[PDB]
Amino acid sequence: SDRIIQITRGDSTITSQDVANAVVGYGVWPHYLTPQDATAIDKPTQPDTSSNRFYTLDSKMWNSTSKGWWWKLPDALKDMGIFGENMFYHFLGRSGYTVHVQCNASKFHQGTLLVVMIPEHQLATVNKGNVNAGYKYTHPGEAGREVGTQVENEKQPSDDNWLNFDGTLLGNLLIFPHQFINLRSNNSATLIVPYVNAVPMDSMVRHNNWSLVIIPVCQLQSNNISNIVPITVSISPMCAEFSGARAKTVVQ
Amino acid sequence: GAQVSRQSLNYFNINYFKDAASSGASRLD
Amino acid sequence: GAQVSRQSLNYFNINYFKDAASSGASRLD
Amino acid sequence: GAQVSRQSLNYFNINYFKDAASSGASRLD
Amino acid sequence: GAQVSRQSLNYFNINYFKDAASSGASRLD
Amino acid sequence: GAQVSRQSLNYFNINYFKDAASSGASRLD
Amino acid sequence: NPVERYVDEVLNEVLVVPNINQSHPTTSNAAPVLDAAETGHTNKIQPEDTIETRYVQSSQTLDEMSVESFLGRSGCIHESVLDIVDNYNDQSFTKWNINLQEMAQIRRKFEMFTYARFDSEITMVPSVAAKDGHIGHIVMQYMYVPPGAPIPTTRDDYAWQSGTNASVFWQHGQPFPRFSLPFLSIASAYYMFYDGYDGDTYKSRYGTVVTNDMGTLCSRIVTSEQLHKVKVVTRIYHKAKHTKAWCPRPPRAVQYSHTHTTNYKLSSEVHNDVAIRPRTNLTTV
Amino acid sequence: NPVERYVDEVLNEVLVVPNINQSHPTTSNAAPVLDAAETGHTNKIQPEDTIETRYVQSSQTLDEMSVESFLGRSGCIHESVLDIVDNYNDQSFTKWNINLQEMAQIRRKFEMFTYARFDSEITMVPSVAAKDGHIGHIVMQYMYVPPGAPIPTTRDDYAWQSGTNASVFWQHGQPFPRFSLPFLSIASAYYMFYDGYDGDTYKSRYGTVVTNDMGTLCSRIVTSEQLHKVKVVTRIYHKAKHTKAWCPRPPRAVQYSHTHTTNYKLSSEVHNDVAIRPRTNLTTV
Amino acid sequence: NPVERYVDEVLNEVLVVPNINQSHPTTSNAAPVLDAAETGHTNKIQPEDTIETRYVQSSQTLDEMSVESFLGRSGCIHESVLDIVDNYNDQSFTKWNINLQEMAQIRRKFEMFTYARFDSEITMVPSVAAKDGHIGHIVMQYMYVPPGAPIPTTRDDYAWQSGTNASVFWQHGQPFPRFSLPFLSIASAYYMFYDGYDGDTYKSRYGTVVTNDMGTLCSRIVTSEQLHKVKVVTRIYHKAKHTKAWCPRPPRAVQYSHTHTTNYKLSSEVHNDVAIRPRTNLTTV
Amino acid sequence: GLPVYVTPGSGQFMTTDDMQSPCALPWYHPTKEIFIPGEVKNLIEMCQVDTLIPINSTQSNIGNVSMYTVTLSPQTKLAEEIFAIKVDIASHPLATTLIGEIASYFTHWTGSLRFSFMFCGTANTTLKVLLAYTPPGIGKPRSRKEAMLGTHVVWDVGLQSTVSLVVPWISASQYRFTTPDTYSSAGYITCWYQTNFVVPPNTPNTAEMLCFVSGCKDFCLRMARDTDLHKQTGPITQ
Amino acid sequence: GLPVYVTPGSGQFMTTDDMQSPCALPWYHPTKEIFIPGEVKNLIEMCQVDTLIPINSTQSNIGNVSMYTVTLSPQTKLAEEIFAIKVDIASHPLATTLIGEIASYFTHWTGSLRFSFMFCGTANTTLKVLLAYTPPGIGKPRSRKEAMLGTHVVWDVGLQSTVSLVVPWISASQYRFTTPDTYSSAGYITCWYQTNFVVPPNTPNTAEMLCFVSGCKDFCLRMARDTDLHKQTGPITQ
Amino acid sequence: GLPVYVTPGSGQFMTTDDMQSPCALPWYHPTKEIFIPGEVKNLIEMCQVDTLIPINSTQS
Ligand SMILES: Cc1cc(CCCOc2c(C)cc(-c3coc(C)n3)cc2C)on1
Ligand SMILES: Cc1cc(CCCOc2c(C)cc(-c3coc(C)n3)cc2C)on1
Ligand SMILES: Cc1cc(CCCOc2c(C)cc(-c3coc(C)n3)cc2C)on1
Ligand SMILES: *C(=O)CCCCCCCCCCCCC
Ligand SMILES: *C(=O)CCCCCCCCCCCCC
Ligand SMILES: *C(=O)CCCCCCCCCCCCC
Ligand SMILES: *C(=O)CCCCCCCCCCCCC
Ligand SMILES: *C(=O)CCCCCCCCCCCCC
Ligand SMILES: [Zn+2]
């Protein structure tokens, strides 16, 4: 059936019996760095199955007033087993991902989530002059950020979902790799994205390559509101490889 | 852009720019 | 720097300087 | 407008404009 | 002063004056 | 006025005007 | 054939749009008009699928819509001012930290892409205003100072010797100066956006300021002090050549406020901050 | 042979007129001189048919009478004035809604056809009048603003950045600026006349104003305010290249009064309004 | 193939750097990392010898690092001043004993070699400052006077006739003058350094002044005295072409004090005289 | 030397000229190009991707995601109008969509537009809607019967959530102006209830609908111009 | 004459242009070239030669040859730090070395660096030292254990007096700025006692060490610029 | 560079000259030409058509 999907990565297998196909970002499947594009000269470490597996983040609750959520990669996985360890023990890292967003309800519920993967989502601050988003705020980890909850601070990024948190209109986010989780049609979204950057490998501690943004464009509604409807995200690194081994970087 | 003819009387109908609008007056007929 | 084609309609794609950055707009596709 | 002769000593009697009046002094005889 | 190569990609390494000092930067190696 | 030699190293000894006095310095010997 | 290709260039018919084919009535259990936007794909339905079309030969071309064409137009990126008011030595030279972020028109176009790689053509338009009447003989010097090279602190600084740096001297009356610059980045492409920092602390810088340092442009009136004061304004124009772009993104919807950042300001009446004109209601066209 | 054709171009002998052949006396029941103008056709009688002609070899050519030649001469179509009187910011820039209707000389020639298709060559002749004595360093900017693009409202408007629009910068002392423009219409030909409206109500516009919108030409003195005031008059000249024309019509017989309309005014003595000189009577030559 | 070589020139890929090859773990009695600097040779160990490297294809080129490139940039070597103050006849002409020792920027680069052979390209940038308001019609004469030729002692000296010497006349408004000079030495190469004297006595001269005499450059304003005084500053730029260099040496570490000599001055706090920034201690990075 | 004739235009600087110029950095070798996914070679590639139309952009909705949704509900009157907009690619509310934004960088447009709609109600909510395109030369339809006489699609909501209506290029001229021009106004698109929004008991009585737009295989833009959908009212500083 | 179009840029003087110009001395025949040993054709040749690092350039040592030596001696505490410097080619104390000086005439650099050390103690003095390179993205190591986790060489002093540590090119970008730039800082090199400085009786209890640096086969500089390691604060007179 | 001799006439603008000039709208593709009846290629075509003479053009 075209409604079913099984994704196996390492020791993890994920299923969904109500999918809306899958999207491969920019039509390129993740792959290891080739010698023609490489620059760092040391032999890379490739953890394989111990790193390229599904890691499930903290679930979020979707309710009638939710404004959205976002996570940044690789930041969201910095504390996820072997993948996390490798990104702090090495200066350079490189990886692709399989993002599987999960959200089931019922045939009597309605709502629509816009799931987008944005490359170089450089957040903006509002009405704060040339003060830019603070490192701490763009590195929330697996908890991600719940839009419209954070008590503002000077280095606090924008929480304007309609302006993509960066000064562009929400309706045009569809130009980026995306999928919709329309409760009447599917209960999950799957996006496979390759490594995208102007350099072959980069510091995973100070450069977030992709940003996962989830915005409910159609409010969650039903006649059984007491039943909590969560949103769960499972991300699996792909072709993760690291370079420049040394001591473990400790942030903060 | 050079239309080189030969007869010797060689003709060089050069077009210096890449847009047709740029060329001079048209030939006749 | 001259790419001389022939068809006669001869094309002369001359590159006057020695650095690639110096050339004009790129061709398409 | 090019009258190319060869002998090598090649002659190029170029006519830059399209009207006969435009050319320089006439040859003799 | 013209070093005409062919490959068509024809090269014209012209030397406009009669003294070697007059030419531009040297080639390499 | 073009004395085209070939060796390829092609020489173009052009005489732009029609009077011998107009040419540049003479060759030697 | 490079000559046929050449003709296409002259006529601008390198990229032709497809024709519309004649279609007919249909009664099928295959419904092209129905699909699922959830997939993240655009339904590729064409006019022939929804109505009965006639055959039409298309003569439109997409040449002008190419990235080379879109970004291949020279636009202003800086207006340098040298206003001689009361101190020639201090007011006859200046410097600018180069960037393509100060003028909204070209900035917005480049920012419709995440990464871009191109060579640059810079053309300068100097205009000398005779504040006191005469302009004399104005000769300008524009010196490109790569990051690290010594920046002149006086109009007679030794750095102006330009022993290695590239300087362009312009003489009033002569045509506008112009030169080309190869792709300058240390990376494979320029970052139009950069979700990164130059460190991992609360005080680390964020954005393209971390990656896009192109150096400094130092200008000076070479001519020594003259009786009559002048105000020289040099406008720098930039054009992208041999361009490549990656990962398209939404166009800037609000005004820019600063360089190297996506920051913006919102008023109490946000509809005034965007180009969206409020509708009376859903049925009022 | 393109070389023989070339020689014809140089000598202007591409289109030769026929020869006159020798004729003789005739006595026939075939009367070429008699016909019927009612048919709407012109009797094709030639001199050999009415008199006894000699043989004459014609050497006349019709090259100069070609449409390309007739419309291929540069004529003035606009005189732009920038007169600095008392406010530099307001008086240093202007705009013009482009059209070929403001100057009678070229307008009349184009209007001898119903439709015309051509490329344009624009040449500009700027002249700076030194009202106070010196002119300083004048640099002009002519920006073509297609319909829809933002029109600058001040001399420092961001639109002058010309990030996409085509701007031409001229420096006083340098040769007259000149550029070519491809056939600009959204239709297959330009309408010289248009018996139509942009709607079906009493207030709908009538004529070519509905179809011939070519945008706006915005000019500005780039140089900042100078001590001495100047009056810059830029005359725009237009020439048609690679021309095609359809359906010839009668030449304008009365003076033009407005653009985009055939409207005219008549005095009480109409003979003064037309080029017809009153005859004394039918037999006074 | 001269065409393939040509492409390499355009792309600047004439000199490519080697690739990094993949290496593996080793356990051997051959220790490349160990050597003896006493030999005066540099240990040629490469990254593959000390760590496990991956295979990487190099795309870097050394073209820009060539001697031709390093010394092939035009830098200022002299600033000639003709300041008309109160005596036109005396102040309208001057002379300079040619040398490449007066401007630190290019001097330091050439002095990184012991001997150098090259042709020279001289470009001059004259700027006329209107001290009193108008500049009139300025025409300059730059005459090269080889050692031995008569040096003009007045602005109307017969030597200005330039019957044999090479003179360059420049007219204000015309492009910057420029000419080439063949390798001028009587030896096979120019001495950048010379551990010798022009004799064997206590009063013999020491250094390059003995070997590097290039003559004198004599300048004069050709125009006769004008009402308004001007200050003409002519900056001479020099570029090396078709260069060859021998025996590289350490770069100048302290400021230059005089021409043709390595002499220098030291303050009581020598760390201020060199570019070395004092370290706090051995472990403070 | 070779006799030359300096032609008019010499020395001028035309922002759209295509000339060569010396390189300020001779011998410099650019950084090696690496493969980066997502290369764009022509803007048409961006015009063929669906983006949301801020169709419900009433003053109160602007600044809210709700400006992108149209609400549907059980009707008491038959054949009611749901929405109506102009088809003109750069008119509002189409202006800020990706295709509208790009079209605003050009003067002329041509081709067919593809409008898609995705129903967001429950899986148990049914509905039949009529989407119509009214060619120019007439006012927007006042009733379903009037609209129905033009180009239209009857959308039946079911397993497949999305439908597409194609606005064919029906014009006198081969191109139209991107900027609002009476002579080149392209017409209207209206939406009407074909049957009705029906739901079982205990099911939300309203539902949202999303609207998309993109260009068909024949879409084409011409004559580059600066956009009027973005401005700079002051200096952009550091 | 031939119609021409004068292009923008005409008449300008760009210090890096590459044009031809008439020769002021026609007919002149240059002096015959003779063979001179030591011809240099590319600056890379100079970058591949070892030069001493003024590593001990403390204010008191500058102006003394001692600024070029590091002193070693018997330790009472194990794994003590000996020295630490930045790997950045144009940073201090690397700046005044031949490779640092040449790199300062360019804007970008890439490649691997070769650091060599020569022990100058007596033939009877033994020692084992750990030389480490710490890639960026972390502070300089605070201990031998921390340093040891990165790239390193354990040097055993013996018959062969010199050892070489290669700092591999480990970077995100293909090039780095020669001038101090946060984004392109290359890391650190630290030296620690692996065992200890040991000597027999009647042998000096301290010894010196010399430090060298040069570029590997992949070292490369780009974008010529004027150096900031030398200035002119006044006229240079006769 | 190639030595040149600037000839008299240079820089002038003659309304009847025939030169080339750069195109302000590069890449622009003109609207397709369609068949329109009545094309005129030479004014002689109009001179060969009969038109009425206002022969009785007395002031009245
Ligand atoms: C992204 C991105 C790409 C760039 C490069 C812009 C080019 O900037 C320069 C300008 C305007 C002038 C010169 C320059 C060089 O030489 C002279 C005289 N001026 C050099 C550069 C790099 O900046 N940001
Ligand atoms: C019929 C018909 C045909 C036309 C086109 C006339 C051309 O008008 C223009 C002029 C005079 C100048 C420019 C222009 C473009 O770029 C610059 C600097 N000026 C552009 C146009 C379209 O107008 N009516
Ligand atoms: C070493 C070394 C090599 C040289 C030669 C420098 C070139 O100097 C000259 C300059 C600046 C101008 C002229 C010159 C010749 O003709 C004119 C008008 N000016 C001639 C020379 C030799 O000087 N030191
Ligand atoms: C046409 O498409 C290109 C036009 C090129 C202009 C340059 C014309 C001069 C060519 C001289 C070449 C001489 C041949 C050896
Ligand atoms: C390309 O690498 C060199 C470019 C040379 C520029 C000069 C072009 C004109 C050539 C005219 C030669 C005529 C042939 C006999
Ligand atoms: C004659 O009818 C046309 C005159 C063309 C003028 C241009 C002459 C220069 C031709 C250079 C071509 C070089 C050949 C490869
Ligand atoms: C070299 O020794 C002589 C250099 C001649 C300069 C003129 C170059 C232009 C030649 C054009 C000839 C076109 C061929 C038919
Ligand atoms: C000699 O008698 C006539 C000199 C002609 C001067 C023009 C030289 C340039 C020729 C270019 C022709 C290019 C060949 C196709
Ligand atoms: Zn005056």
PDB file of N, CA, C and O in Angstrom, chain G residues 31-44:
ATOM      1  N   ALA G  31      -8.420  10.898 -12.278  1.00  0.00           N
ATOM      2  CA  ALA G  31      -8.691  12.309 -12.030  1.00  0.00           C
ATOM      3  C   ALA G  31      -7.428  13.107 -11.725  1.00  0.00           C
ATOM      4  O   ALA G  31      -7.026  13.251 -10.569  1.00  0.00           O
ATOM      5  N   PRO G  32      -6.771  13.625 -12.775  1.00  0.00           N
ATOM      6  CA  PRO G  32      -5.550  14.416 -12.601  1.00  0.00           C
ATOM      7  C   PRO G  32      -5.740  15.622 -11.682  1.00  0.00           C
ATOM      8  O   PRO G  32      -4.824  15.979 -10.939  1.00  0.00           O
ATOM      9  N   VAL G  33      -6.922  16.241 -11.722  1.00  0.00           N
ATOM     10  CA  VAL G  33      -7.182  17.414 -10.890  1.00  0.00           C
ATOM     11  C   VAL G  33      -7.150  17.123  -9.392  1.00  0.00           C
ATOM     12  O   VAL G  33      -6.943  18.032  -8.592  1.00  0.00           O
ATOM     13  N   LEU G  34      -7.356  15.865  -9.011  1.00  0.00           N
ATOM     14  CA  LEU G  34      -7.334  15.488  -7.599  1.00  0.00           C
ATOM     15  C   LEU G  34      -5.950  14.990  -7.204  1.00  0.00           C
ATOM     16  O   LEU G  34      -5.314  14.229  -7.937  1.00  0.00           O
ATOM     17  N   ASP G  35      -5.491  15.416  -6.034  1.00  0.00           N
ATOM     18  CA  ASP G  35      -4.174  15.031  -5.548  1.00  0.00           C
ATOM     19  C   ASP G  35      -4.103  15.244  -4.034  1.00  0.00           C
ATOM     20  O   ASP G  35      -5.137  15.347  -3.365  1.00  0.00           O
ATOM     21  N   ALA G  36      -2.888  15.311  -3.492  1.00  0.00           N
ATOM     22  CA  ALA G  36      -2.704  15.514  -2.059  1.00  0.00           C
ATOM     23  C   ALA G  36      -1.512  16.420  -1.792  1.00  0.00           C
ATOM     24  O   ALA G  36      -0.366  15.983  -1.857  1.00  0.00           O
ATOM     25  N   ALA G  37      -1.782  17.688  -1.491  1.00  0.00           N
ATOM     26  CA  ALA G  37      -0.718  18.646  -1.222  1.00  0.00           C
ATOM     27  C   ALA G  37       0.130  18.239  -0.014  1.00  0.00           C
ATOM     28  O   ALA G  37       1.250  18.727   0.149  1.00  0.00           O
ATOM     29  N   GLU G  38      -0.404  17.351   0.825  1.00  0.00           N
ATOM     30  CA  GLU G  38       0.304  16.880   2.015  1.00  0.00           C
ATOM     31  C   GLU G  38       1.673  16.298   1.668  1.00  0.00           C
ATOM     32  O   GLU G  38       2.617  16.382   2.460  1.00  0.00           O
ATOM     33  N   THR G  39       1.765  15.692   0.488  1.00  0.00           N
ATOM     34  CA  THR G  39       3.003  15.072   0.021  1.00  0.00           C
ATOM     35  C   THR G  39       4.160  16.055  -0.098  1.00  0.00           C
ATOM     36  O   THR G  39       5.327  15.656  -0.081  1.00  0.00           O
ATOM     37  N   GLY G  40       3.833  17.339  -0.220  1.00  0.00           N
ATOM     38  CA  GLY G  40       4.860  18.356  -0.355  1.00  0.00           C
ATOM     39  C   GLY G  40       5.237  18.582  -1.810  1.00  0.00           C
ATOM     40  O   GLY G  40       6.192  19.300  -2.112  1.00  0.00           O
ATOM     41  N   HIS G  41       4.480  17.969  -2.714  1.00  0.00           N
ATOM     42  CA  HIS G  41       4.724  18.100  -4.148  1.00  0.00           C
ATOM     43  C   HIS G  41       3.616  18.919  -4.797  1.00  0.00           C
ATOM     44  O   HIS G  41       2.479  18.946  -4.317  1.00  0.00           O
ATOM     45  N   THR G  42       3.953  19.585  -5.893  1.00  0.00           N
ATOM     46  CA  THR G  42       2.979  20.387  -6.615  1.00  0.00           C
ATOM     47  C   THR G  42       2.333  19.502  -7.674  1.00  0.00           C
ATOM     48  O   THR G  42       3.034  18.779  -8.389  1.00  0.00           O
ATOM     49  N   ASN G  43       1.006  19.546  -7.765  1.00  0.00           N
ATOM     50  CA  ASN G  43       0.288  18.748  -8.755  1.00  0.00           C
ATOM     51  C   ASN G  43       0.693  19.286 -10.123  1.00  0.00           C
ATOM     52  O   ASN G  43       0.521  20.471 -10.403  1.00  0.00           O
ATOM     53  N   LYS G  44       1.230  18.421 -10.973  1.00  0.00           N
ATOM     54  CA  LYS G  44       1.687  18.858 -12.283  1.00  0.00           C
ATOM     55  C   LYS G  44       0.627  18.942 -13.374  1.00  0.00           C
ATOM     56  O   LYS G  44       0.938  18.799 -14.556  1.00  0.00           O
TER      57      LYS G  44
END
